[model samples]
Target: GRRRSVQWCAVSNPEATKCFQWQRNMRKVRGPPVSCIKRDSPIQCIQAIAENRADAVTLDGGFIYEAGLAPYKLRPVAAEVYGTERQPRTHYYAVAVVKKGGSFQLNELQGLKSCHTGLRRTAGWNVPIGTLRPFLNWTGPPEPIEAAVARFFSASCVPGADKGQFPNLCRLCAGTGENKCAFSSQEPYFSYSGAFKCLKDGAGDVAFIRESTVFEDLSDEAERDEYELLCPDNTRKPVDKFKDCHLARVPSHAVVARSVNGKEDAIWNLLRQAQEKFGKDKSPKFQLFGSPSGQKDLLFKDSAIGFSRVPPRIDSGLYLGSGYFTAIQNLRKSEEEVAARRARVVWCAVGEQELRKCNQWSGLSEGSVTCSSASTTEDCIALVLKGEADAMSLDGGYVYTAGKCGLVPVLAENYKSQQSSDPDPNCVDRPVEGYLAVAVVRRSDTSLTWNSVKGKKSCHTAVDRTAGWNIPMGLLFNQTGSCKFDEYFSQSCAPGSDPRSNLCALCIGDEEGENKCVPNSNERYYGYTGAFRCLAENAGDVAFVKDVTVLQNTDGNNNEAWAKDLKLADFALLCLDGKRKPVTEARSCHLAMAPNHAVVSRMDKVERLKQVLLHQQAKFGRNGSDCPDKFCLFQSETKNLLFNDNTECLARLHGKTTYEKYLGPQYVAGITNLKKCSTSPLLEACEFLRK
Candidate 1:
């Protein structure tokens, strides 16, 4: 049972025969046993994998998307590696090849005859179709992408298309009778070499194919020079220069299996031994990546040097990346729906407080912005990843978490500097000066200095928060070299932790005392304001929060029942030197310089989200035309809601768009070290989707 045979799903009889050859060779070499399962189509093979009739099947990127969807839900277990051993890669460039003497550029290809490797394939279909979508005037589905392509080109040989439905799509096919525009090798214009030949023989004006196709077919450099590549910028280059002149760089074909109990270990074991023993020129008895003369790209890509074991975390969607996955998804959706998605930004608001603010902000933006609500910060992040929400403002600690889930930081919240008396006109362009994370205690708690606070109760914004959790807890963890946080603090309210644990003991619920210890605003002792309120009320000995939290709530800055009489002089910062100082001394006595909170979104929505935020802020920001007179975006019902109360403007990232870059190396490294002590289900879910 430990060495169960991997049943390879074969789409055609020829492929099944080759699989049998692979099976025989694998047995003779005393490797992991191999078996073949025949199927009428790749879709059937996908079903077989899902139904457990077969263990694995290699599929193109577009099919990979479908396999990952609905009932199949297959995950990529291994990738076919191309290029030489010294410079191996699990991706290839899709290029549009044209004749050398054709004076037409890429933009002028409309109404010209075209050649395609196959329908629903990566290089030949998805990349080329997606690249030309804007130019084709093709409203998305209801009307298939095939119909649009059929009209865009005058005549073409697109293998796997329904020749009867779109006769023009298969007009230039070199095949005869029933073989015309066939999906299999029986068709003369079916795959890379076939499509290239259709162009070379002048049956079509251009061939959409992989970058390696030209080099694979043409033996001499001079003959290869007779062809050229059409670049996306409407320019042309020699065929060999595909790197700089391609439609898109797509992921390679990958072997997919069920997400659960997919026999991934045995599959890898089989592929490793097969590739090493019979890989390109490794052995002549049977080639793992080669097929007979009549067939092409059977079992696997013809020239693939070997198989690379995909990381256990990578599922089909993550393996394909955003660009390819989005392309395929758009082809299946209505044009109106896709257009509507691009026209507005959907904001993910965590908690009712943020949602209320978001709704108020939304109405002022002429319906350009809208709101979606979640119970926790992590839920908002998941919503963004699933495309249910467009963007949300997040702390640096959350920026790292969202970044790991494939979201990018769009813009950062800039704050007024301590010495600034007047506003600067260029706040949006100025680099963000990070804030300080301070340990706050009541002035009367003179005995609760850093060295004297052992076994004392504490308050935090929430678990995994920047100023609240990462900075203070990370510093403590580094100093003590232990992860036993519950033991260090006698009783605390670190919301998002176990409701019955000592961490949640200090958390008081909302007005009705329900939703206690919940991560969001429902918990009375959550976030900066809540943590400080806990300290102000003498519920804890020390509060780990930011400097602004204390400054905003004390000195008559806040008018809440619990904070109306609070004075700035009544609080002290617990310095790392074990000396207590005024709140104003936090810049020098703080735990860490926390990066400013920034807005995060999926890659597809970054530009639109950034633009909408900029436009909205200009109208409702500090010096906005509508501030106070209408609704101020940065103002809050309580201190530091939605956008921070101290926020001056949403500043540019200046190219620090990635979470790692935005949070900085040292900060990321600190979080990385601290994360070993606890587990994040959101992180675990993201990792399962990403390698």
Candidate 2:
């Protein structure tokens, strides 16, 4: 008398009870006679369907497709509604809750090492492992789930009793008072009663469940407690929960059939009917069966189904017309546009390997791909003009040259692509996990107050250049503003050049004589002290030196040793150019030149002469200053016929006097006559005249 009856088995989390109810209500009015069989696990239902034990099975969208059951043409019967807003359904939720006053910190999973934990096997483990671990990593023990929990509550670790008497099952512990257990998930119905019973019997503390059964009871409480709604990545919060939680809506669902036959069409039609029936009922009946907490009704009332019906296919004529009609229109328009303007070909110079891999260029054969090597800027430019390449990687400095030659540079060093390295050694303590474009330097070096030679030297690692001469030259110029090879000779060179001119004398190895050079005298010098040997021996000043390990090993005889021992003013504070104020104080007379032993020396004289020359050229010739005393002499000498060598000399003398006054005694020192005076001259007489 009844239409051929079919058994439909459905496994769902308790949260999906509303969906199951909707299915039953829909099938009652539909053509086919259907019987609904509930199973605790979707996996079990899927297995039954796969083995033909049941004609059909209602399962989550992800479960159906992921289990490779798509060939059966299993269809979605109905979609779930989320809330009163009637938002589309979702199959997932972001859960954040813990048993009130539990010793466990819910924010971090490592804290789970101390706290008891539990999971409704289906709701917690069946979701994609990716989704599960981020939460687990926050809440579960540091070790794997089983081992960490076992170790946490072991009788030896917790208190008395036999070792195996109480197997530490991950369970929540509620502190004193009402002793409430709060669990939240998108599918609260999936919460297994077995897990809850385990917690209630003192095996665990609390469980956060997502089954519709649990949700129906707890949803109102969740909102009232201000539980955070799990919004999908990048989506606004409080979205239609029913739609967001449904895994089926993400893509197509996996449908399976007993056999490939017309039966699939029939099933598809039946599914369409079910969706229509269920879709019309905006407020569906829902129930929470397991807990006595009365929190169930708040979670599951008026829930919607999460699946949607598929769109219908178009007929042949309309399909053909839309496809071919649009194609022809596009072709005609493109042809007209192409004819209006000649097609401009873009050229690009890419690595030969990259080009070969892409294989997108027309007429590029194996041999053609082998010929693309750019050896010079000219070669690269030629490739661009010939349309062989549109862009080329050029050095940042050469970008201007390339532009002048009619080629444009679209990128610069500032725009260069950057990649991150794992565990960067430079940042050994705080290694970067992701790529960074700009270089990082220690904050101390940039701070104005921290002035140590070692600190300044450390900046080289973070500076633009680290290779060979750049670092050395930069250090030298930073200290003395010049790196004349003569300066090195003046300090450490052999006696042939006046001892006063020997810059390298203090550093030179003695093959013919006993050399007292700082580096040659120390055993560590040949090993670790090699880098600093040049600067130390030559008496060359530098902002900083590398290989500080040698400085530490020098038995208190290194440059840093010398500086600390003599209490020499840190050279960084010394002002070589009298125009700029000294970091501390100025001198009465500039230390022009002195022997290696002089606090002011011959090498110093050369550098000061250079600075003085630079200042005069810049002041009189380029950026003229407003000093009447200094500029008036120049004007007078130029205006009269009195601009002789003496006039030039006198003008320089007057300018030096003014400079000396501004610089003060600390920087200038007392002027001494070159003529070997019997007595030291007066500090005032050293103003501007040279004896």
Candidate 3:
């Protein structure tokens, strides 16, 4: 028998003792004295297989694929199947396991970036970092697997692993007992080593492992009573049924042959026989090392069947397929929680300017609003309509586009044009009176007069048709009497061409292309920088603004400078009724103050404030009677004293603190004096107090 003996070798890392044991057990049953060539490094095992020193290799499928061994035709022989179902190759399933009683939720990954899952270099890291972390846009620094373990342990009451011991058992062990150091052997085989070790070492709050591994520990009564599975659906699979764990992948193991010469057919037949024996259960098992080259070995010399360990499929069935299991588990967990507890956050897109304005209102007592600056109006509206944002503050055009989803307007453009009963939503409808367009060249350009721009470089607002083109053409018509604009510039009169022909127009301008011009055609170029003592410090360039009031003759005095500066042609006296009037030739270049009135919500307050002013005027008249005939208390100087200076009674009335703190500070401060009378008690009381 020794004369024709075939040699066999088993190659595997020292860390995988169970795999080696499985190889040995299979070899003993199949008549092969398997020589265990235990490799310290997985790389060495791979090299042995590449160099033909080992008949078959036992390692991760990922390593097998990476080695460039059998570039097109390398196949898996055996894989580990967990539990009692040996025929139907089913191993394990990954599960999110946590310390028995932990406050940390899976959803709180954003704040727990430092939590550990021991295996830094494994598919477990991908579940959280690759899948969960990106969705939350977690901003925390990366943490080591140990830190995550510590975080989990700190939050719960779980036993810590002893030095040099695995951490998997720590996750299942709730109480601090000596046996708490033990972890289910099935878990390590099912790829739970990383998280298990993390929990065992007290470095993790939770562990992710396979269901098969968890059930193996549950089968042990001592471990089962202390641990509880989170069965949100309250559904448990029958442990005895092979069909329950029928869905699985093949494991990686070693296969060996015994006889030397002419036994290849015998070895092949033996493997086929095993396949037939195990394949009927819907969970097939196969040799870890089987190939045409393996058939040529002396071990398979004259055999019709061979002996090899039938490994289960662990990678494909468990690690790769865990996402579906996790998702279904999460759905079940959600069903167990209160249905009313739901997420309530919305996003909003707004313009930079609008966002700036809304920032003043965000997190205020009025409401909680957040805004993201949108690059375009359409994008802003899209965010609102798509439910990405609750609402958005936008311009009229954008608001119109937003329609029902548009935010309510809070402030109007022009307060004076608003009506009393109009239910002012604060959105003012101030239509464009006419496009303000103008042209102004450098003051030193002697050849570049307003008329000289006919054929030269021109600029206008994108929406301005008049000064941008039409009026500029009109100025050219009046000056050069030519309509052929293309003759001046090579390009056609179509817009957007010829930067010189259409340089850049202000968003708002007048017909003269003067940005600072007033609305009146007669006083187009005139603007007031200041009047009396009130300085218009922040008034921007006023070349072309619509609906502005012009001052002609002040206090009936002839102001020829004002008329000349404003470019008024003539002056005439005019009078009109309050409502409407017919224009006459005599009313040219007239000045009038537009009657101003406040449309107050409380009209009685307005009348009361007015009466207080009148009373204060009468009181001041009596107080300063001895000053002078021209220095009357109610005269301009006295009016300024009463309204502007400290001596003024109206100034005292203006002090809200006086009226607010005390009911009669206005009367006591001499800001108001009632008419002296004996008839009415209120009037008599005011007169008596004034004296």
Candidate 4:
């Protein structure tokens, strides 16, 4: 029978022919009838894959994005794995190389000579240029890239420059004066080795190349010692330590195919068997990862020994990751195109309730806003990080998750306290005081304190909840230093917990096992209100809740069956030093003071979203005139809207706090402490999405 065939795209004729002949000269009955298709460049091959003229091709991360654009829709099929055969990684660092003992950092590269591997390669072009863009003082639209670059550096050797019109852009090229600084070996300073060679020859002050370039050249220790990598932090380190010191870490190259039914299986079979047979000296006859002398990374990365199947569900946008994708999008698009998209505030809505409210906000904004929705908050985080959505308000605890995943906090909630005597109902001037987390117990049962409550039944808002779980659990861990939480509590109703454990023992389900321990309002024994109901009904000895929980649910404020006649005067707070105080004294009896929730967005979109929110708040806030009875930024009836129901107004955070400053040290530490024990779905969900 005739065999299955796949036509692979190649950039070089010699390498393409070699690949074609080798597959046919297969060791075991010639596995597949592999053929070759040639394309002139990376961008051309992308169109070939989209047009179905080529079955597969490898693309640098920058071009992986260009290939992912409309009309030429393509996705990564498999990724190159770098490192030893045993332990491999799918990421590498892009760096700028300078002679050790050089006086300048990346910020000092103006009016100086420059070297680049190619016009659009990641390390040489996109990553380095992306980092230095803030320092470039060019007016965006009218300035041609060559003119801007020509002014930035007095002369440059950008290998793929259009040497005909902008000769100064190619003035520093080591190529012959008339060859157009060709993007190939025809230019002496074109590849990684050549770019570094450009630096070594004193033709340039900086060489933008991959980390491996330094080690690949310079075999002697003295020669290696003469070079150092220029990191984004403005520090220099030895070339061997590129792992810790580099400009930016980027995703590995991926083999791409048409987005539709692109013969994915046949292509996988051909590459798998080919690598197993000829990969990395597996067969001395024709090594898959080897290149002819003076040639590098032909059909595949000469250094890459294997390929890993990309996730079947991965689209090109997801495969590139949010942060990395944004960097590449900036490189591929014109200034005005990107500026046009960031013009509006796109809020991400997580559940059905949130989506409905977000849609209402959209109607009110009159096209000043829009929305994207997902089933969970972590899913929303992934969407915003990818630029599909611009921002969202997150829970205080959830903010820690977003920060760890590299998002920035832009604005914070400034609540107007119902109990305060000061008269600033819509205050946006000063920072709001942090919320008080306390343990609430019905006043009549005064038998328990912090140390004596080990065997008592407890009610918590939810597991890993900042107010309900992290604050209480973090304090107890500091005292015991042991993780026997389930045993210590004896019995508990930790709603949204594993019902399989006694943690849900005190839970009072609304209807035969329907609304037991859970997170949402469906659970009768859930949030601050639900936990308090458990205490009010004598099902639980204590309720872990925020200070305002008792005030909001009791004294005829709540008309539920369990809490219709509950009294605010009947609640007491348990102090850490074995003292019991009235609910009014939470100022001294509280377990912790934690930061309120904040809104997060990409750094580029932060300022624009801030302006839209301020304007939106003025029209529909608690006391705004636009929607007196229709909508309110705060005071939602059933649940929280985009922000806390009690929020006074969105206030300016101190000095544009990044994720690190807003979440704070103790808060992050508390969140980290909860991970050892069985926790909530946020951390695990974040890991799964990013992985």
Q: Which regions in candidate 1 have their CA more than 4 angstroms from the true location?
A: 1-117, 122-135, 150-157, 162-182, 186-325
What 10-residue stretch in candidate 2 is worst by lDDT? 595-604
Identify the leading candidate in terms of TM-score.
1
lDDT string for model 2 (1-691, tens) is 3245455564544434544554566555654444555566656666655565655553433454433334343333323334434544433332322233343332233333222112323333322112223233223323343443344333111111112333443223232222222232221111444333333344433233343423543445654232222211212222234222221112222233343221444445655554454443432532211212433421122344433432221111111111121222222233333222112222232233223322332122211212243423344444443333434333221232233222332211110011212322222122111111111112222332222222222111111112112333233445654435234212322211223444323333344444322211221112123323333332333222222222232334333543234211222221223222221222221112110000011110223333433343234321245224244212321111111111111112212212223223432232111111221111111110101
What TM-score, over all chains together, does every model reach?
A: 0.70, 0.27, 0.26, 0.69
Name the weakest run of 10 consecutive residues (lDDT summed) in model 4: 682-691
Residue 198 of model 1, lDDT score = 95
- Per-residue lDDT of 414-522 in model 3, one digit per residue for the tens? 2222112232232123321111123322223344333233344322211112223333333344455454444542222222223243222212223355432211111
Q: After superposition, how far is residue 562 of candidate 4 from its true place, in Å?
A: 5.7
Q: lDDT score of model 3?
A: 0.30
Winner on lDDT (3 vs 4): 4
- Residue 2 in candidate 3, Cα distance off native in Å: 22
Model 1 local distance difference test score: 0.84
- Candidate 1 lDDT tens digits, 161-241: 888899888888878888888998989888999999999898999999998889879987898888999875467899877
lDDT of 4 by residue, 390-479 (tens): 899876777777766557788888776645656475476677577889998888866888888777888888776788888887888877
What are the lDDT scores of the predictions, listed in order? 0.84, 0.29, 0.30, 0.76
What residue pairs are clashing in model 4?
A: 496-518
Which has the greatest lDDT?
1
Q: Sorted by lDDT, highest first, which candidate order results?
A: 1, 4, 3, 2
